[PDB]
Write a protein that binds this ligand. Structure first.
Ligand SMILES: Cc1cn([C@H]2C[C@H](OP(=O)(O)O)[C@@H](COP(=O)(O)O)O2)c(=O)[nH]c1=O
Ligand SMILES: [Ca+2]
Length: 135
């Protein structure tokens, strides 16, 4: 996979944000993870939702460098959102959330699963430490 620079425009929630990519603003959704809902009335404001939003926000707003890394399959979902692994100063936001118990590994659609094993390994650690979502 190849990392590419992006510029933070606006953090939305734990797993969705707006970035300036290749000159154009675009919304991104983190690959292989799911942070709790804070919008959509059908899901409601789920537990740890606000926590996940704050974690992501802090991490991306304080970063000197943000990079996007598309996987090997489709790069956007049905809603026109870019699907990527996002790095804040070299640290993957996707993994950071999972390791903290702020997100679950989900939506594993191949072949967009290059980092699946890595994220699962972190999820198991968060689980055995009964962190947040796993408490
Ligand atoms: C992470 C991811 C989400 N999605 C879809 C699945 C869900 O569709 P539905 O809206 O049909 O449930 C939605 C989950 O994202 P949200 O967690 O932002 O809702 O976006 C993909 O299609 N591919 C992906 O890789
Ligand atoms: Ca979500």
């Amino acid at each position: 996979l190849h990392k590419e620079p992006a510029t933070l425009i606006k953090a939305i929630d734990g797993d969705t944000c707006k970035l300036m990519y290749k000159g154009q603003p675009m919304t991104f959704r983190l690959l292989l993870v799911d942070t709790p809902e804070t919008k959509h009335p059908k899901k409601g404001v789920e537990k740890y939702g606000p926590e996940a939003s704050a974690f992501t926000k802090k991490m991306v707003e304080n970063a000197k460098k943000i990079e996007v890394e598309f996987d090997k399959g489709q790069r956007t979902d049905k809603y026109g959102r870019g699907l990527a692994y996002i790095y804040a100063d070299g640290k993957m936001v996707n993994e950071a959330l999972v390791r903290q118990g702020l997100a679950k590994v989900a939506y594993v659609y191949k072949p967009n699963n290059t980092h699946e094993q890595h994220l699962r390994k972190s999820e198991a650690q968060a689980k055995k430490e009964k962190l947040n979502i796993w408490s």
